[PDB]
Amino acid sequence: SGLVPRGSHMDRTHERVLQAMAENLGEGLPRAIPLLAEKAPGLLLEHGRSWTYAMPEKGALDEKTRTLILLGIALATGSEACVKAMAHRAKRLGLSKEALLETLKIARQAQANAVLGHAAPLLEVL
Amino acid sequence: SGLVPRGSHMDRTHERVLQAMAENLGEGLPRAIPLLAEKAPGLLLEHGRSWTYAMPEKGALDEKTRTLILLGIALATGSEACVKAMAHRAKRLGLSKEALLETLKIARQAQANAVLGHAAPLLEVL
Amino acid sequence: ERVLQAMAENLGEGLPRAIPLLAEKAPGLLLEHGRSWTYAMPEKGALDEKTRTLILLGIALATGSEACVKAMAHRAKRLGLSKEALLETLKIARQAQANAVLGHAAPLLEVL
Amino acid sequence: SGLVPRGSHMDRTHERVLQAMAENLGEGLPRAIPLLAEKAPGLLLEHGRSWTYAMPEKGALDEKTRTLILLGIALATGSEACVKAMAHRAKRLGLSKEALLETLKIARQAQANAVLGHAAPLLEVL
Amino acid sequence: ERVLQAMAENLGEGLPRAIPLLAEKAPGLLLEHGRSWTYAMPEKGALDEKTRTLILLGIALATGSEACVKAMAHRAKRLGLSKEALLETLKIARQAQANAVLGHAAPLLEVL
Amino acid sequence: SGLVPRGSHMDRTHERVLQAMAENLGEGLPRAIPLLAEKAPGLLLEHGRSWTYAMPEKGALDEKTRTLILLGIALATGSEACVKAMAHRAKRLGLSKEALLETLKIARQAQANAVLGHAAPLLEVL
């Protein structure tokens, strides 16, 4: 159920990793992925290895949760490629519209929250 | 189970909102919260209203998931106040060490992912 | 120097810890800092010092620059900016950050 | 006059908020807004409510100052959708070329200022 | 102008869309841009143009500045920087962003 | 020599990675590192593995260049822990005051550069 297949980063070609991402992200596959396959295939496999290290096939959180965390982060940090990728990832996993919209509301709240958290020095002088 | 009580942002004093946050965040309560209570209580209630709008008491995601999304975002954006607040929030909810550590690994992966997503213009010229 | 004195002048307790260090170890950089500041915000320019300060304050809050938030907060108080104006600036920075998340949401909304 | 009508968040539908934003932002309207109107009207209404809470009619700052603060933040944070929206808002409000260019210079200076603000640990060892 | 020509010179297809616009509508800002750049990176300074370019490239990637990533990428290719050096710079920027998350994790780790 | 020993990620415990980081970073060691060693050794080992993957012994760039790139990124992103760590790393490697100050000037210029890079939409309407 992971983004890339069991042990795919251990392959002797970048093909399995690339195929799984194209397959699981569809139109949301970042433009940089095919470019890595072509110009830095080792870095693409390292990308897959690192992804799996963080999110093992049978880990602490389910795929829904992992995807929504990644989606929230992408939105809060303004990573267009990651927002598109996780939105499509979520669609293919069949995550619900209500869950995706709540994630969006949460990312929006988080950014607002951070401003207040950074406001102490200002509040102190009022 | 929410961060602030049912309809607390509708109160005629900021006290319920403040108490619930101090209670639910403990030592992780951001320094700016008490300052808001003192100097801009209306903004503190607006903070609580907005929090509840994004995460209704019976919403699309459970409190564990909401907290981990907020935690991931805080870590990825470097909001020290939000990282401390969500870490304590998670502790009080009894979230597992394995779930928190996986969230940390995910936030770390997300930031690495974003760099690759921003790398297309560079990869294109190699 | 006078670039250092003037800054300690209008910032007080909000003077960034890095400013004295620059004066001590990289005076040329402290002068360049003063020069670029004046280029961006000249005397008798397009905006008054109040608006300039509120814009810098808004940005500092939105970007999480602890040193600039404190510095612009003290600067604002020295200029006599009202509590209402400073709190409105904080609400605006808070909304700007929320606004940017919605601005980045098109790719997600498209798939719903 | 504000970006959206006061109390429009209490409207039966999101129509009034959408029309006001389209009119005031023109070609600068973020593509996300029409999508919210279509798929998450409640969030578009909350967007309007939150906007008017921060910037009420006859508040502490005039629309020119509010717009330049938002534009400065947009440039400093690299929010493309906000830069475009506030530039069009500014144009429609009739803000001067000189004021807008000074805002750009200030946002640029702010980002440079922050780097020096974060330099204490480095200068410390020099 | 020559500040504009020189930039189109060493950046080519990677010249930011904003540079010609500045030349057209805010020439004074384009000159200031050129002046501050030279102040930060003078001829015969502390670092060679290769290192300077890789540092700017690393930063652009880490901060998500699309215009600077493209601009520094083209600049690097014009200077003849090797593919290995540019890919190593990308891996480094990627690691720096990962490093910063761990750097911000103390408050979380403390509660485990 | 690199921040940590090559292949140390395969060590039975995190001890070697921890000792090398403490020695090479000194007082600049982030407080998170000892905590990882105590509570999430696997992540400290992966941190070392990922570090050496990006920066292998005898790679394309020398340690001076690698350190200044990391320092520049740290300053530009406001990562306090990284600024302190790379400043101490630089000092221990014996990097010149002039090189470090030029890196600070470059990071400052980079942040200013980015604002202009994001200004097209605004300049467009001027």
XYZ file of C-alpha atoms in Angstrom:
728
model
C 0.000 0.000 0.000
C 3.098 2.201 0.156
C 3.993 4.811 -2.472
C 6.693 2.485 -3.832
C 6.840 -1.365 -3.743
C 8.574 -3.537 -1.132
C 12.345 -3.166 -1.544
C 12.031 -1.296 -4.839
C 14.799 1.113 -3.825
C 17.139 -1.894 -3.756
C 16.566 -2.633 -7.476
C 19.352 -2.453 -10.044
C 17.374 0.010 -12.225
C 15.234 2.993 -11.214
C 12.229 1.596 -13.138
C 10.195 0.047 -10.299
C 10.385 3.178 -8.187
C 9.515 5.394 -11.171
C 6.582 3.222 -12.279
C 5.010 3.061 -8.821
C 5.180 6.839 -8.441
C 3.727 7.493 -11.895
C 1.067 4.927 -11.086
C 0.263 6.170 -7.587
C 0.510 9.909 -8.301
C -0.844 9.966 -11.850
C -1.108 13.502 -13.212
C 0.253 14.695 -9.866
C 3.692 13.156 -10.488
C 6.151 16.036 -10.025
C 8.032 17.109 -13.149
C 11.289 16.546 -11.283
C 10.700 12.761 -10.907
C 11.100 11.771 -14.601
C 14.034 14.182 -14.806
C 15.715 12.399 -11.863
C 15.092 9.004 -13.535
C 16.925 10.344 -16.584
C 19.696 12.400 -15.035
C 20.214 11.139 -11.481
C 18.599 7.715 -11.155
C 20.596 6.963 -7.978
C 19.053 10.042 -6.332
C 15.587 8.802 -7.382
C 16.249 5.466 -5.649
C 17.562 7.342 -2.609
C 14.325 9.334 -2.661
C 12.397 6.056 -2.613
C 14.591 4.566 0.114
C 14.126 7.630 2.292
C 10.373 7.651 1.702
C 10.134 4.059 2.893
C 12.386 4.615 5.893
C 9.995 7.321 7.082
C 6.844 5.381 6.220
C 7.438 1.629 6.464
C 4.894 -0.670 4.818
C 3.603 -1.689 8.284
C 4.279 1.356 10.371
C 2.857 3.427 13.158
C 0.366 5.375 11.017
C -1.973 4.262 8.240
C -1.695 5.560 4.632
C -4.632 7.929 5.029
C -2.980 9.663 7.975
C 0.434 9.755 6.303
C -1.030 11.302 3.163
C -2.994 13.950 5.073
C 0.094 14.902 7.103
C 2.117 15.253 3.865
C -0.749 17.208 2.296
C -1.022 19.566 5.253
C 2.704 20.238 5.208
C 2.728 20.871 1.429
C -0.095 23.382 1.729
C 1.438 25.170 4.763
C 4.886 25.440 3.111
C 3.591 26.323 -0.343
C 5.225 23.376 -2.133
C 3.124 23.350 -5.331
C 4.631 20.051 -6.521
C 3.875 18.319 -3.202
C 0.358 19.737 -2.975
C -0.491 18.385 -6.435
C 1.207 15.076 -5.762
C -0.544 14.463 -2.428
C -3.912 15.604 -3.755
C -3.714 12.982 -6.498
C -2.289 10.436 -4.093
C -5.297 11.061 -1.818
C -7.722 10.775 -4.771
C -6.281 7.415 -5.824
C -6.522 6.142 -2.242
C -10.152 7.257 -2.211
C -9.779 9.586 0.798
C -13.069 11.419 1.437
C -13.855 14.939 0.376
C -14.681 15.835 4.003
C -11.286 14.558 5.211
C -9.410 16.485 2.500
C -11.329 19.684 3.144
C -10.710 19.361 6.900
C -7.007 18.874 6.203
C -7.086 22.077 4.137
C -8.825 23.947 6.983
C -6.206 22.600 9.403
C -3.253 23.692 7.274
C -4.828 27.140 7.013
C -5.340 27.239 10.826
C -1.750 26.106 11.442
C -0.298 28.987 9.464
C -2.567 31.426 11.339
C -1.588 29.772 14.649
C 2.094 30.244 13.886
C 1.704 34.005 13.465
C 0.184 34.270 16.949
C 2.978 32.040 18.285
C 5.511 34.480 16.804
C 3.699 37.479 18.262
C 4.962 37.431 21.856
C 7.626 40.155 21.441
C 4.979 42.451 19.984
C 2.296 41.595 22.515
C 4.788 42.194 25.317
C 5.080 45.891 24.489
C 1.373 46.743 24.235
C -12.219 16.170 23.192
C -11.433 19.380 21.310
C -8.696 21.829 22.325
C -11.355 24.212 23.666
C -14.851 23.396 25.065
C -18.148 23.391 23.149
C -19.069 26.989 22.294
C -16.361 28.453 24.526
C -15.514 31.082 21.904
C -19.052 32.420 22.368
C -18.447 33.203 26.074
C -18.570 36.733 27.459
C -15.047 36.421 28.953
C -11.910 34.828 27.499
C -11.516 32.589 30.583
C -12.957 29.295 29.289
C -10.845 29.372 26.154
C -7.717 30.302 28.134
C -8.268 27.620 30.790
C -8.820 24.823 28.276
C -5.635 25.718 26.405
C -3.549 25.945 29.578
C -5.092 22.657 30.637
C -4.687 20.857 27.316
C -1.255 22.244 26.395
C 0.292 22.455 29.857
C 3.912 23.595 29.728
C 3.531 23.766 25.947
C 1.093 26.700 26.124
C 2.627 29.383 23.886
C 3.783 32.538 25.661
C 1.573 34.562 23.330
C -1.680 32.994 24.661
C -1.658 34.572 28.167
C -0.523 37.828 26.564
C -3.549 37.737 24.219
C -5.864 37.041 27.197
C -4.475 40.189 28.814
C -4.094 42.524 25.864
C -6.407 41.283 23.108
C -8.954 38.910 24.631
C -11.246 39.252 21.585
C -8.419 37.961 19.369
C -7.966 35.004 21.757
C -11.658 34.119 21.371
C -11.330 34.530 17.602
C -8.373 32.147 17.778
C -10.597 29.641 19.576
C -13.488 30.160 17.158
C -11.216 29.613 14.178
C -9.670 26.519 15.748
C -13.109 24.987 16.191
C -14.282 25.934 12.712
C -11.349 23.983 11.282
C -11.685 21.066 13.693
C -15.301 20.609 14.793
C -15.953 18.455 17.859
C -17.372 15.701 15.597
C -15.504 16.198 12.379
C -13.939 14.326 9.529
C -10.701 13.420 11.338
C -10.053 12.176 14.867
C -7.980 14.154 17.429
C -4.925 11.950 16.980
C -4.818 12.665 13.252
C -5.501 16.378 13.711
C -2.707 16.682 16.260
C -0.185 14.813 14.102
C -1.035 16.978 11.077
C -0.540 20.136 13.197
C 2.680 18.673 14.608
C 4.035 17.822 11.171
C 3.293 21.306 9.889
C 4.917 22.969 12.937
C 8.085 20.939 12.482
C 8.257 21.526 8.691
C 7.714 25.303 9.052
C 9.946 25.725 12.090
C 7.245 27.184 14.354
C 8.889 26.574 17.755
C 5.750 27.600 19.670
C 3.547 25.210 17.666
C 6.017 22.333 17.905
C 6.104 22.625 21.703
C 2.360 23.084 21.939
C 1.506 20.068 19.763
C 4.116 17.872 21.427
C 2.494 18.509 24.803
C -0.964 18.222 23.301
C 0.037 14.803 21.918
C 1.498 13.747 25.299
C -1.709 14.646 27.136
C -3.766 12.718 24.576
C -1.469 9.747 25.137
C -0.389 9.442 21.483
C 2.251 6.703 21.132
C 5.962 7.257 20.894
C 6.029 5.305 17.604
C 3.322 7.540 16.090
C 5.121 10.732 17.169
C 8.475 9.530 15.887
C 6.899 8.522 12.556
C 5.321 11.970 12.309
C 8.779 13.473 12.873
C 10.264 11.249 10.140
C 7.433 12.300 7.814
C 7.935 16.021 8.407
C 11.641 15.542 7.722
C 10.834 13.606 4.495
C 8.353 16.282 3.387
C 10.943 19.034 3.567
C 13.402 16.857 1.609
C 10.640 16.028 -0.909
C 9.940 19.710 -1.471
C 13.540 20.421 -2.477
C 13.339 17.759 -5.196
C 9.968 19.185 -6.276
C 11.635 22.595 -6.661
C 14.542 21.121 -8.606
C 13.024 20.814 -12.086
C 14.594 23.987 -13.553
C 18.004 22.756 -12.435
C 17.501 19.173 -13.550
C 16.336 20.421 -16.941
C 19.746 21.883 -17.759
C 21.919 18.893 -16.823
C 29.685 54.495 14.890
C 26.627 56.675 14.179
C 24.798 54.002 12.208
C 24.987 51.889 15.355
C 24.072 54.736 17.722
C 21.027 55.734 15.656
C 19.751 52.159 15.577
C 20.220 51.681 19.322
C 18.431 55.043 19.430
C 15.185 54.095 17.678
C 15.010 50.397 18.673
C 16.082 50.326 22.303
C 15.595 46.940 23.987
C 14.492 45.610 20.610
C 17.891 46.100 18.972
C 18.846 42.713 17.477
C 21.743 40.938 19.255
C 23.408 40.752 15.852
C 23.690 44.535 15.402
C 26.340 45.189 18.044
C 28.179 42.077 16.833
C 28.185 43.458 13.297
C 29.502 46.796 14.537
C 32.309 44.923 16.263
C 33.222 42.335 13.621
C 31.739 43.449 10.316
C 31.350 47.262 10.357
C 31.230 47.387 6.573
C 28.149 45.169 6.608
C 26.478 47.356 9.231
C 26.984 50.394 6.949
C 25.636 48.539 3.926
C 22.628 47.557 6.035
C 22.060 51.227 6.839
C 22.560 52.224 3.213
C 20.128 49.702 1.730
C 17.544 50.582 4.392
C 17.683 54.271 3.401
C 17.506 53.345 -0.281
C 14.326 51.372 0.307
C 12.803 53.963 2.674
C 14.155 57.443 1.852
C 13.310 60.591 3.790
C 10.222 62.167 2.223
C 9.428 59.052 0.199
C 6.191 57.402 -0.907
C 5.074 56.132 2.514
C 5.220 57.618 6.004
C 7.224 55.982 8.787
C 4.047 54.560 10.354
C 3.059 52.624 7.237
C 6.657 51.571 6.690
C 6.867 50.204 10.226
C 3.556 48.368 10.000
C 4.597 46.742 6.710
C 7.913 45.588 8.205
C 6.075 44.382 11.318
C 3.523 42.463 9.255
C 6.275 40.790 7.271
C 8.314 39.874 10.367
C 5.291 38.198 11.930
C 4.395 36.365 8.728
C 7.951 35.086 8.238
C 8.619 34.199 11.848
C 11.637 36.509 12.188
C 11.890 36.830 15.962
C 14.534 39.557 15.758
C 12.488 41.708 13.376
C 9.232 41.254 15.258
C 10.851 42.513 18.460
C 12.744 45.251 16.630
C 9.750 46.571 14.731
C 7.553 46.298 17.848
C 9.881 48.594 19.825
C 10.298 50.886 16.850
C 6.515 51.218 16.539
C 6.113 52.087 20.219
C 8.859 54.711 19.915
C 7.069 56.274 16.952
C 3.851 56.384 18.989
C 1.828 53.931 16.877
C -1.478 53.068 18.563
C -2.275 49.752 20.197
C -5.228 49.370 17.808
C -2.992 49.852 14.767
C -0.482 47.287 16.027
C -3.126 44.710 16.879
C -4.808 45.246 13.512
C -1.403 44.675 11.874
C -1.094 41.386 13.794
C -4.597 40.248 12.672
C -3.646 41.136 9.107
C -0.400 39.130 9.203
C -2.356 36.226 10.671
C -4.930 36.420 7.857
C -2.201 36.762 5.182
C -0.715 33.441 6.226
C -4.169 31.826 6.146
C -4.822 33.456 2.755
C -1.636 31.929 1.277
C -2.745 28.402 2.154
C -6.002 28.952 0.233
C -3.945 30.424 -2.590
C -1.959 27.181 -2.779
C -5.050 24.955 -2.643
C -6.198 24.978 -6.294
C -4.515 21.655 -7.208
C -6.286 19.984 -4.259
C -9.723 21.523 -4.832
C -9.528 20.486 -8.518
C -9.565 16.799 -7.541
C -12.630 16.995 -5.283
C -14.650 49.807 1.087
C -13.545 46.331 2.130
C -12.824 43.323 -0.063
C -16.220 41.796 0.846
C -19.498 43.130 2.344
C -19.803 43.274 6.124
C -21.859 40.368 7.435
C -21.812 38.611 4.051
C -20.582 35.512 5.883
C -24.160 35.157 7.192
C -25.587 35.100 3.670
C -27.627 32.048 2.633
C -25.093 31.249 -0.103
C -21.509 32.239 -0.949
C -22.673 34.215 -3.991
C -22.234 37.728 -2.618
C -18.728 37.022 -1.265
C -17.713 35.468 -4.599
C -19.078 38.389 -6.651
C -17.406 40.979 -4.464
C -14.048 39.210 -4.664
C -14.250 38.770 -8.451
C -15.116 42.462 -8.842
C -12.482 43.772 -6.463
C -9.672 41.432 -7.580
C -10.429 41.097 -11.275
C -7.894 39.008 -13.139
C -6.056 38.835 -9.807
C -8.717 36.549 -8.290
C -6.922 33.333 -7.149
C -8.053 30.228 -9.075
C -8.775 28.656 -5.688
C -11.704 31.017 -5.033
C -14.013 29.859 -7.795
C -13.150 26.283 -6.763
C -14.090 26.951 -3.135
C -17.352 28.491 -4.293
C -18.101 25.311 -6.248
C -16.805 22.683 -3.820
C -16.443 24.177 -0.350
C -18.704 27.248 -0.066
C -18.533 27.110 3.715
C -14.773 27.699 3.558
C -15.243 30.617 1.123
C -17.724 32.141 3.612
C -15.295 31.617 6.506
C -12.555 33.164 4.346
C -14.764 36.230 4.048
C -15.641 36.197 7.752
C -11.984 35.949 8.763
C -11.027 38.679 6.305
C -13.572 41.118 7.758
C -12.633 40.203 11.319
C -9.013 41.227 10.642
C -10.008 44.236 8.548
C -13.369 45.679 9.586
C -15.008 48.672 7.924
C -13.669 51.748 9.646
C -10.950 49.841 11.497
C -7.597 51.141 12.671
C -5.961 51.212 9.225
C -7.263 52.401 5.834
C -7.527 50.073 2.834
C -4.380 51.478 1.274
C -2.269 50.593 4.311
C -4.005 47.201 4.663
C -3.320 46.387 1.005
C 0.349 47.387 1.133
C 0.863 45.310 4.305
C -0.697 42.287 2.576
C 1.329 42.923 -0.587
C 4.555 43.208 1.372
C 3.841 39.939 3.175
C 2.982 38.233 -0.127
C 6.276 39.281 -1.739
C 8.330 38.386 1.340
C 6.748 34.917 1.606
C 6.687 34.234 -2.105
C 2.934 33.607 -2.224
C 2.304 33.980 -5.941
C -1.481 33.983 -5.657
C -1.390 36.720 -3.020
C 1.121 38.901 -4.903
C -1.110 38.826 -7.996
C -4.275 39.389 -6.014
C -2.924 42.327 -3.990
C -1.309 43.930 -7.035
C -4.698 43.942 -8.776
C -6.469 45.046 -5.620
C -3.950 47.920 -5.325
C -4.451 48.893 -8.967
C -8.237 48.910 -8.593
C -7.974 50.976 -5.412
C -5.833 53.403 -7.387
C -2.681 53.131 -5.268
C 0.290 55.056 -6.721
C 3.137 53.441 -8.643
C 5.526 55.045 -6.159
C 3.774 53.544 -3.123
C 3.728 50.086 -4.692
C 7.404 50.245 -5.650
C 8.318 51.415 -2.177
C 6.389 48.399 -0.807
C 8.411 46.114 -3.072
C 11.661 47.747 -1.865
C 10.556 47.326 1.762
C 9.663 43.633 1.345
C 13.076 43.072 -0.245
C 14.815 44.908 2.618
C 12.785 42.952 5.166
C 14.017 39.595 3.839
C 17.626 40.868 3.900
C 17.072 42.243 7.438
C 15.933 38.817 8.673
C 19.138 37.115 7.537
C 21.204 39.527 9.671
C 18.731 38.988 12.526
C 19.518 35.241 12.362
C 23.284 35.802 12.214
C 24.141 36.186 15.910
C 25.386 32.584 16.334
C 27.730 32.957 13.358
C 29.072 36.416 14.213
C 29.569 35.109 17.750
C 32.378 32.768 16.620
C 34.025 35.223 14.231
C 21.185 49.555 -19.733
C 24.431 47.637 -19.105
C 23.278 46.157 -15.810
C 20.443 44.583 -17.781
C 22.632 43.511 -20.713
C 25.207 41.859 -18.439
C 22.518 39.911 -16.599
C 20.862 38.736 -19.816
C 24.466 37.902 -20.730
C 25.297 35.486 -17.905
C 21.796 34.063 -17.266
C 20.316 33.565 -20.715
C 17.009 31.666 -20.713
C 17.185 31.705 -16.924
C 16.851 35.485 -16.648
C 13.921 36.121 -14.275
C 10.791 37.571 -15.950
C 10.986 40.349 -13.373
C 14.370 41.672 -14.553
C 13.241 43.137 -17.871
C 10.154 44.511 -16.105
C 12.380 46.239 -13.560
C 14.515 47.709 -16.334
C 11.346 49.076 -17.900
C 9.465 50.317 -14.827
C 11.928 50.569 -11.958
C 15.442 51.109 -13.388
C 16.669 52.525 -10.096
C 15.807 49.251 -8.378
C 17.611 47.250 -11.061
C 20.772 49.319 -10.408
C 20.470 48.876 -6.652
C 20.091 45.140 -7.256
C 23.328 45.188 -9.246
C 25.059 47.299 -6.612
C 24.122 45.127 -3.632
C 25.086 41.991 -5.573
C 28.591 43.378 -6.202
C 28.876 44.455 -2.568
C 28.112 40.932 -1.403
C 30.294 39.260 -4.062
C 33.126 41.608 -5.101
C 35.679 40.839 -7.797
C 38.642 39.089 -6.175
C 36.737 38.444 -2.951
C 36.759 35.616 -0.417
C 35.068 32.974 -2.590
C 35.346 32.079 -6.268
C 32.377 32.372 -8.623
C 31.824 28.597 -8.532
C 31.346 28.491 -4.764
C 29.261 31.652 -4.889
C 26.970 30.120 -7.500
C 26.604 26.834 -5.640
C 25.715 28.672 -2.417
C 23.064 30.753 -4.208
C 21.779 27.607 -5.933
C 21.585 25.701 -2.650
C 19.663 28.531 -1.035
C 17.233 28.903 -3.958
C 16.399 25.206 -3.806
C 16.003 25.240 -0.030
C 13.717 28.287 -0.104
C 11.665 27.246 -3.099
C 12.525 30.339 -5.162
C 11.649 29.150 -8.660
C 13.169 32.223 -10.306
C 16.496 31.856 -8.494
C 16.740 28.115 -9.037
C 16.364 28.587 -12.792
C 18.627 31.638 -12.808
C 21.422 30.042 -10.821
C 21.095 26.796 -12.816
C 21.728 28.628 -16.109
C 24.455 30.714 -14.531
C 26.210 27.556 -13.319
C 26.085 25.953 -16.765
C 27.505 29.132 -18.312
C 30.381 29.082 -15.832
C 31.069 25.448 -16.744
C 30.222 23.904 -13.357
C 30.177 20.099 -13.554
C 27.059 17.961 -13.448
C 28.467 16.192 -10.373
C 28.947 19.491 -8.538
C 25.401 20.616 -9.338
C 23.831 17.321 -8.318
C 25.871 17.283 -5.109
C 24.593 20.818 -4.417
C 21.016 19.556 -4.885
C 21.595 16.619 -2.463
C 23.048 19.080 0.034
C 20.063 21.449 -0.178
C 17.777 18.446 0.239
C 19.680 17.317 3.351
C 19.752 20.876 4.782
C 15.969 20.997 4.758
C 15.810 17.579 6.444
C 18.455 18.724 8.949
C 16.362 21.774 9.942
C 13.384 19.609 10.881
C 15.598 17.605 13.265
C 16.958 20.894 14.570
C 13.412 21.963 15.452
C 12.518 18.638 17.086
C 13.989 19.066 20.594
C 10.687 20.134 22.228
C 9.010 17.002 20.811
C 11.785 14.540 21.678
C 11.838 15.922 25.254
C 8.302 14.632 25.865
C 8.947 11.066 24.682
C 37.008 14.527 6.740
C 33.226 14.274 6.887
C 30.915 15.067 9.786
C 30.533 11.332 10.556
C 32.482 8.147 9.648
C 31.650 6.417 6.374
C 29.443 3.387 6.957
C 28.825 4.348 10.595
C 25.108 3.983 9.868
C 25.719 0.206 9.877
C 27.185 0.316 13.383
C 25.509 -1.809 16.071
C 24.655 1.331 18.060
C 24.473 5.081 17.394
C 27.512 5.716 19.603
C 30.083 6.396 16.892
C 27.802 8.808 14.995
C 26.998 10.656 18.236
C 30.668 10.945 19.263
C 31.741 12.180 15.856
C 29.010 14.822 15.778
C 29.765 16.033 19.319
C 33.468 16.291 18.449
C 33.002 18.002 15.107
C 30.222 20.383 16.210
C 31.246 21.090 19.787
C 28.999 23.582 21.523
C 27.236 23.858 18.158
C 25.741 20.355 18.487
C 21.912 20.738 18.250
C 20.110 19.759 21.479
C 18.017 17.409 19.343
C 20.990 15.109 18.669
C 21.581 13.874 22.194
C 17.801 13.387 22.458
C 17.708 11.279 19.289
C 20.586 9.205 20.618
C 18.588 8.557 23.794
C 15.097 8.128 22.341
C 15.309 7.434 18.616
C 18.776 6.041 17.797
C 17.520 4.669 14.497
C 16.724 8.209 13.338
C 20.175 9.443 14.448
C 21.723 6.619 12.373
C 19.556 7.510 9.362
C 20.549 11.161 9.864
C 24.156 10.043 9.540
C 23.396 7.796 6.564
C 21.563 10.585 4.743
C 24.337 13.051 5.543
C 27.013 10.795 4.031
C 24.851 10.007 1.013
C 24.640 13.731 0.176
C 28.266 14.386 1.101
C 30.471 11.334 0.576
C 34.194 11.243 1.313
C 35.952 12.481 -1.785
C 32.748 13.713 -3.422
C 32.354 16.535 -5.910
C 32.800 19.364 -3.389
C 35.288 19.827 -0.525
C 34.167 20.225 3.090
C 34.715 23.968 3.008
C 32.303 24.434 0.105
C 29.822 21.950 1.627
C 29.886 23.810 4.952
C 29.408 27.253 3.406
C 26.479 25.967 1.308
C 24.849 24.548 4.453
C 25.576 27.745 6.394
C 24.105 29.904 3.655
C 20.950 27.784 3.571
C 20.682 27.921 7.374
C 20.874 31.729 7.436
C 18.463 32.127 4.516
C 15.882 29.796 6.100
C 16.349 31.045 9.631
C 17.186 27.610 11.045
C 18.798 28.606 14.326
C 20.094 25.134 15.148
C 21.743 24.822 11.738
C 23.303 28.311 11.812
C 24.921 27.533 15.177
C 26.007 24.074 14.119
C 27.553 25.171 10.808
C 29.253 28.186 12.380
C 30.985 25.866 14.857
C 31.714 23.310 12.164
C 33.269 26.110 10.058
C 35.345 27.333 13.001
C 36.629 23.828 13.739
C 37.466 23.296 10.068
C 39.404 26.550 10.231
C 37.419 28.449 7.594
C 38.463 32.115 7.262
C 36.541 35.019 8.774
C 36.395 36.540 5.293
C 34.838 33.432 3.727
C 32.229 33.191 6.476
C 31.308 36.870 6.210
C 31.032 36.588 2.453
C 28.666 33.621 2.992
C 26.545 35.769 5.300
C 26.475 38.566 2.681
C 25.474 36.053 -0.010
C 22.637 34.551 2.064
C 21.352 38.075 2.708
C 21.540 38.924 -1.011
C 19.819 35.653 -1.892
C 16.767 36.476 0.244
C 16.571 39.958 -1.335
C 16.990 38.396 -4.812
C 14.011 36.086 -4.217
C 11.661 38.977 -3.461
C 12.449 40.540 -6.863
C 12.057 37.090 -8.446
C 8.492 36.967 -7.047
C 7.666 40.502 -8.205
C 6.649 39.895 -11.830
C 2.880 39.981 -11.132
C 3.204 43.324 -9.342
C 5.546 44.998 -11.834
C 3.204 43.734 -14.551
C 0.427 46.120 -13.435
C 2.686 49.106 -12.782
